[PDB]
Amino acid sequence: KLNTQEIFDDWARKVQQRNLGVSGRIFAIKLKVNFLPEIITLSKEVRNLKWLGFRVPLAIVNKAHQANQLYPFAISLIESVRTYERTCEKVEERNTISLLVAGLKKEVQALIAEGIALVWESYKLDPYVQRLAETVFNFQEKVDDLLIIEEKIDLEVRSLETCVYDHK
């Protein structure tokens, strides 16, 4: 009863039937990165199985290879998209600070527009990951600075209605 050959055969058959492939445009249109978490797990599903001695198929090995190469790039891209989405939600929820953060918004949108034409096979995909991180990094810092300053201005203007009626 303890033989696990059936489990390995079933898993290999399921993954082959899925026919997972990362090739395609790096983004698609909510913004998404065409790199699901599952493509990571298959690589690990090979990494342990090779230790267990099961002869994994060559195509599965190649898919694990592509997953391993593109996973850090996909994490950088999905982190950038998630940061942009949450920060955009924060900015939309507070319409007062929309004008100040206009430059970072148009910059990141322009970088995304440049990247729509890219593919996972593009050599320029890795330099774009470098480009997007810097611009998003600047956008986060300046937004953080304004929130500190804007609250102080909000408190100070709030002080005026209740402050003492003297010129000083």
Partner: peptide, 21 residues
């Protein structure tokens, strides 16, 4: 007044882009 595109309007634009492709 430059304003960030709403999620819905930006995604309708992206829908228009994807559909035509």
């Amino acid at each position: 007044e430059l304003a960030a595109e709403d999620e819905q309007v930006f995604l309708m634009k992206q829908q228009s882009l994807l559909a035509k492709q």
